[PDB]
Symmetry: C2
Subunit: 329 residues, 2 copies
Amino acid sequence: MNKLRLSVAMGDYDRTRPLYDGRVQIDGVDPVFMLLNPEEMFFRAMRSQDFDITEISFSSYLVKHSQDSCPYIGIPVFVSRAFRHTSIYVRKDRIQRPEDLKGKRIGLPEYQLTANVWARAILEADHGVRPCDVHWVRGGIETAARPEKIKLALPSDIHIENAPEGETISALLDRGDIDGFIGPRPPASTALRNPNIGWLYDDPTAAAKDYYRRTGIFPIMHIVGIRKELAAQHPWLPSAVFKAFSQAKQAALDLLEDTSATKVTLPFVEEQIRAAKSTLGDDYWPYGVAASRRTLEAFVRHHHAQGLSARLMAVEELFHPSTYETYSI
Amino acid sequence: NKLRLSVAMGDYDRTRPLYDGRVQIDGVDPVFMLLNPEEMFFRAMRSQDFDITEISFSSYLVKHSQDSCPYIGIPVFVSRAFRHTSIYVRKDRIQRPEDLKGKRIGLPEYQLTANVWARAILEADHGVRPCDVHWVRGGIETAARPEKIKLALPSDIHIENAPEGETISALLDRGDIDGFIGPRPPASTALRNPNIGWLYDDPTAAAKDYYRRTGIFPIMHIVGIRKELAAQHPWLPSAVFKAFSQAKQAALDLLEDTSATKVTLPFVEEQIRAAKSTLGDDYWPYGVAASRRTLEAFVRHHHAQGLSARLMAVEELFHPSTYETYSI
Ligand SMILES: [Zn+2]
Ligand SMILES: [Zn+2]
């Protein structure tokens, strides 16, 4: 009857519902859950250490983790994965092709955002548009005032100036003070209605499938974290958490694959699952290190290149030691 | 003082906001139970467990056409999907759909909502009419499975039980049957047979053509309220219609946001946009007007296939108070 009363903060996803509801339980924990949008969760996690266990920005975690001054230790539960080709909005009236973004003004909400890292990596690795080749403009998407959640020491070849106060990135794109936009959300709707704003990539699905064939990278946005002290005091707690989230994803996938009635409000789910399994592999959204090696390997590289890691991190130091492998029968 | 009602629905994105209280039913204190379709419809039709329940559109229509269904429907279509994916065949025998004339197709029960849409495709598009087929009925996962309600099928429909103890899935695996239709694919052991797969090589493609041609986004499930309840509380149909409506809007609001994709799929952003393109902004519509072509076709097929006792008019499908909602 004696368990750990911990707070747990995650998103509201199919892959977390079975946790939320108790269908999946955490060994030796009595959870207390709060379901949060990413923005709220990471702001609070990084500046306030609200939670015992929390979903976190992979980027932000790495910033603080690279300096051994992060309150949390990560586990390889990738509750957020997604290609971020869809992440890049441009003024189609100006930009014909990605290479045109050299020496333009791109806006982002904060530089160190996980999606932004993957996005800048695409622009570098396959259009030659390097961070330093861009006038960066930082300001909110919906609300005009938005800080960098953690302080950065970016190399000074990265030119970066705040948005005019009171004006969002969304607005600045609308008026075309910036030529481009990257972040985890599209620009605000008023902006979206401008006929001249749209994805850089005309066919993001196609470009991302190519990317994946080329690199084997299914970008990771979010990991999960536990307070350092907690992991030290309870050496089993990392593994326990890893398992639960793992089970929850399996439970949700079990439900999702059933076509008696499709569990998301989309058409063609049957077809999608099978296409996903075809392009990515049966375990298309894997948790776990080995199963994500290419992606992890790339992240540390990009993170260090883009100027957010102290030194170039080793996959081997990214997570709590007890989580680089799970048992099998 | 509210109405203590039991509510039985599936566990979908579009029902979560109901389940967890985010969306509430006017004047009701709901007790929710999340059920797989098979269990829910079995219980709903044969023992009237629930005050409000998701139901087989087909089943409901069977009992509703005889004016002796305990429930009255509302146009909350918590289950929609194309059922091109619904037809598995032995690819080694059936090269194209027309080959199914005079073959043995297996199904779990004849009256099943997806089966109706499926037989309609085979008729409307390949000339394979119900009567042209040796039907075999047995479970997919368990061998013994009753027809939920009695049917008076016209005698041109030849239909026999599966060899006792054997599932449809097995029967397809051994190739005692050439074809299979149902809301679920055959069991996995069967699925491993390299000779089994979809009739349609590109179901998505065929369905998008179908939709261009007909404007039909098949409905599987509606929602239902006990007759007495609707009579005693003339506002209760409308209230329920709204709640489910809001829950779907809430879920769609969450799903469209790309901060983190709420389903475990890749490319959700792209999917949504494609779906909206082919189907319309309200790609998964509740409500009658927005579903007219689909509703129209259903009653037709249902009556053709021999499951409607009377001619049904779209106008008598749902409780009268739900043929329209207000607007600002
Ligand atoms: Zn981020
Ligand atoms: Zn059904």
